[PDB]
Every structure is written in structure tokens, then in C-alpha cells.
């Protein structure tokens, strides 16, 4: 029945700003009775703040909550690397409802990824399947690019790349490509290849290895 | 205060799903008990909540296909939801809710917000079936590097459904770990590969093994991960 609007969809800061995290009802809270939660990757809500105001035990005193009937609040003083997340608003005040959310995001300098790449194990190679995989390890920004190259061959439709989430520590990213042969094919080719291609890179990097050796 | 929950995990279409939570805390006749639902990628959302009383409250649009139940001998609460779709895929999620009061001229929830949490039950709803997955070795290269780091993991291949939990060391070293989310190959099981950063000098004097767990087909693996030499 009361719907919660939050603003903005998106947000993102540098280190140490100030956030304002807005949250709008389609019809009065009652006395004071609202919640903001924390949501990190891979984990469970946390309890902020509650009753519009209350810090939570455990939670650090840059978080602030205000406001009343309409129009509700967050405030957080001095932002940090680790207060990336995806904050939600709750009334309780009926039957809980929930905000559509509001992700924060941190900005920083331009980082350059670390480059590592995995040959297929002997024991894979029994399936008859080789998974060669390109590790890009704690690069800011996340436009990134990767090529595979066989035996100088550029290859593609035979890979995925996964990337994870804004670090908790440094905020940056880090992506996986994973080259998907069959055995008889990989066996094939001697020299595998992978070259990488971001901003903190003045020239592409390449990463390789020799089949057997 | 500690929630553990467990639940099937995979379901065919229009099958009932049934999870179920256990409080070991105590207090657990002091306040209500909710779950709570998160679509991947979406918005959290409300379901129900309920007292050792065994009364209960839902919520208005999944009204007609709840079910929540108390067993107050062994101190838990489960959930009933019929008819599953693919539109009902999410994460499940145990909670502790507000009190429930009992007044002279009123009776309701008061307080009624969520702390703490379970760690979460994803529900994939298909028609598929389940498979265990292989893990296979990410092996140094054992060259002689001209940076101190270096880098070995684990290649978690062909599960379903997910999700596939990863630890190293049995949690004895967190840092510069990395996991990536799984990746849904054309085979249609998923994949994923789980990395870890360390000096160099440690590859030779210091054992690394990853422990993936795969809950839904109740594999569990331990693989030591050494260069090729």
C-alpha cells in the first residue's frame, strides 16, 4: 500500500564527500518508523539505522538518518572504500515495504590491471575439454578489453569474461576470461596468448605461454 | 543471535517451494520471524512474518500462495510458497521482525525491522537437473617473476544450479582473494573461477588449497593447488 521511491538510482563519489540519499513515501510514516539497510556484493542486508535516526550497534558514526512524513534522508559525513554498497529504505510503520535501492558507487584514480594467465590442467585435459584462463587483477576504470590470440590467430566466440565488484579496499575491479577448447584443438597450437588493453596501460600488455613447456 | 537455514534450492515449475529456518539465539519467543526475498539484480521484497504464537501476517500480493509454519520444540519457522514460476526465483532470506503486541484496544507489529539476517537461499526454478561440478587446479608459473606477487586459483566447471561457495585455506587467508560470479556457459551449466594473489617466495614454503562447496548436490572439494614445475 505505501510505496517507497528513492533518489537517485545511481550515485557516484569520491572518497571522503559527502552522500545524500533521498527517499520519498506515497503516504505518511508513521511516527517514526523507518529503516535503511546496507547490502554489500555476495551478502545479506544489514540493519543501519532505525527509527529514522538510531545508528545501529556497530555502525560507524559517519551515517546519519533524518526526516519525517514524506520525505526521508540518509546522510553519510565522510564517505569510505568500504561503504560501497546498494542502500535500501523500509518503512514499518505498515505492512514493510522496501525502496527500490540506491548504488553507490566510489571513484578514484585510474589503476592498471595485473596480468596472469592460466594454462589448462592435465588432469581437464582427460574431460577433453582445455579452459584457458586471463586473469586482470585491481584495475580502475572497468573499460577493459581482451584478446585471445592462438598461434597468432585472434579468437572469437570461444570466450566469457566475469568481472567482480567495486573492491572493498581499493575499489577497483578485477575481470576473468576464460578460452574454451576441446582437446584435440589445443593440442593443435603451440604458443597461447593474451593481451589486454585498458587506460592505465600505455600500450597493450600480452601474457603468454608455449603448449608443453 | 545466529539464523541457519536450508531448503531445496531447485524446483521444477508449479512445485511448492519449502525452506525452512532455525534460530539458535534464543529469545526466540521475544519477536517475530520474516522472509524476505531478493530477484537477482533487483529490489528486496517482503513476504511474511511470524510469532512462536503462530500467528501471522503476509503480504497482500502473495496472498493465497503463503504459508508459514512455527516449530517451537526445535525453535524453527519455515516458509510454503506454491506454484513457483521463474518470475519467482530469488534469494531467500531468514530475519528477525518486530514484536508482536498484544494491547487492550490493539494488537500489532511494532518495530518491525529486519536484524539480523540469514545468510540467504538462492531458489532457481527450472526444469533441469542438478549436477555437481569439477574443479581443476589455476597452477603458478613458477618463473623465476620479476614482481613479488604471484597469482594461482581455482577453475570450478560445469554445476548446476548455483550457487557454489569458495573459501581458501578453510578461511585462513582472506585477503587479495577474488571470486568471480558464475558465468551461464552454452552448455547450460554454470562456471566460475575463484583467484588469490600472494608473494612469490610463498609458492615454494607455504600450501594452498581452495574448498569449493556445492550445497545442492552435496559435493564438497578440497584441491591443493602447487606449481608445475
Known amino acids: 500500500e505505501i510505496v517507497l521511491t528513492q533518489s537517485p538510482g545511481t550515485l557516484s563519489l569520491s572518497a571522503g564527500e559527502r552522500a545524500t540519499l533521498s527517499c520519498r513515501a506515497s503516504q505518511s510514516v508513521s511516527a517514526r518508523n523507518l529503516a535503511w539497510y546496507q547490502q554489500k556484493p555476495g551478502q545479506a542486508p544489514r540493519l543501519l539505522l532505525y527509527?529514522?535516526?538510531i545508528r545501529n550497534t556497530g555502525v560507524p558514526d559517519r551515517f546519519s538518518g533524518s526526516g519525517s512524513g514524506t520525505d526521508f534522508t540518509l546522510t553519510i559525513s565522510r564517505l569510505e572504500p568500504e561503504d560501497f554498497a546498494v542502500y535500501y529504505c523500509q518503512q514499518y510503520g505498515d505492512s514493510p515495504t522496501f525502496g527500490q535501492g540506491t548504488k553507490v558507487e566510489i571513484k578514484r584514480t585510474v589503476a592498471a590491471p595485473s596480468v596472469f594467465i592460466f594454462p589448462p590442467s592435465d588432469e581437464q585435459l582427460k574431460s577433453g575439454t582445455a579452459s584457458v584462463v586471463c586473469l586482470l587483477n585491481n584495475f580502475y576504470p572497468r573499460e577493459a578489453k581482451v584478446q585471445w590470440k592462438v598461434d597468432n590467430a585472434l579468437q572469437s566466440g570461444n570466450s566469457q569474461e566475469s568481472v567482480t565488484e567495486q573492491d572493498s579496499k581499493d575499489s577497483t575491479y578485477s575481470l576473468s576470461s576464460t578460452l574454451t577448447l576441446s582437446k584435440a584443438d589445443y593440442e593443435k597450437h603451440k604458443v597461447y596468448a593474451c593481451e589486454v588493453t585498458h587506460q592505465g596501460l600505455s600500450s597493450p600488455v600480452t601474457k603468454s605461454f608455449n603448449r608443453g613447456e | 543471535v545466529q539464523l541457519q537455514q536450508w531448503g531445496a534450492g531447485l524446483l521444477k515449475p508449479s512445485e511448492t517451494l519449502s525452506l525452512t529456518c532455525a534460530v539458535y539465539?534464543?529469545?526466540?519467543?521475544?519477536?517475530?520471524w520474516s522472509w524476505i526475498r531478493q530477484p537477482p539484480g533487483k529490489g528486496l521484497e517482503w513476504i511474511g512474518e511470524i510469532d512462536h504464537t503462530g500467528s501471522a501476517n503476509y503480504n497482500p500480493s502473495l496472498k493465497s500462495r503463503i504459508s508459514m509454519s512455527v516449530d517451537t520444540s526445535m525453535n524453527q519457522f519455515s516458509l510454503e510458497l506454491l506454484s513457483m514460476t521463474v518470475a519467482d526465483t530469488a534469494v531467500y532470506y531468514c530475519?528477525?521482525?518486530?514484536?508482536?503486541?498484544?494491547?487492550?484496544?490493539?494488537?500489532?507489529?511494532?518495530?518491525?525491522?529486519?536484524?539480523?539476517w540469514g545468510q540467504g537461499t538462492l531458489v532457481t526454478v527450472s526444469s533441469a537437473s542438478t549436477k555437481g561440478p569439477s574443479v581443476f587446479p589455476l597452477a603458478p608459473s613458477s618463473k623465476s617473476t620479476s614482481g613479488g606477487t604471484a597469482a594461482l586459483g581455482c577453475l570450478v566447471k560445469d554445476y548446476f544450479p548455483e550457487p557454489v561457495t569458495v573459501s581458501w585455506n578453510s578461511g585462513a587467508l582472506t585477503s587479495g582473494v577474488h571470486t568471480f560470479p558464475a558465468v551461464l556457459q552454452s552448455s547450460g551449466l554454470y562456471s566460475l573461477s575463484s583467484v588469490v594473489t600472494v608473494p612469490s617466495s610463498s609458492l615454494g614454503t607455504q600450501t594452498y588449497i581452495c574448498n569449493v562447496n556445492h550445497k545442492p548436490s552435496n559435493t564438497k572439494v578440497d584441491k591443493r593447488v602447487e606449481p608445475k614445475s
Open positions: 539465539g534464543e529469545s526466540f519467543s521475544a519477536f517475530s
Open positions: 530475519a528477525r521482525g518486530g514484536r508482536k503486541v498484544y494491547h487492550a484496544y490493539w494488537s500489532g507489529y511494532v518495530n518491525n525491522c529486519f536484524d539480523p
Open positions: 527509527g529514522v535516526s
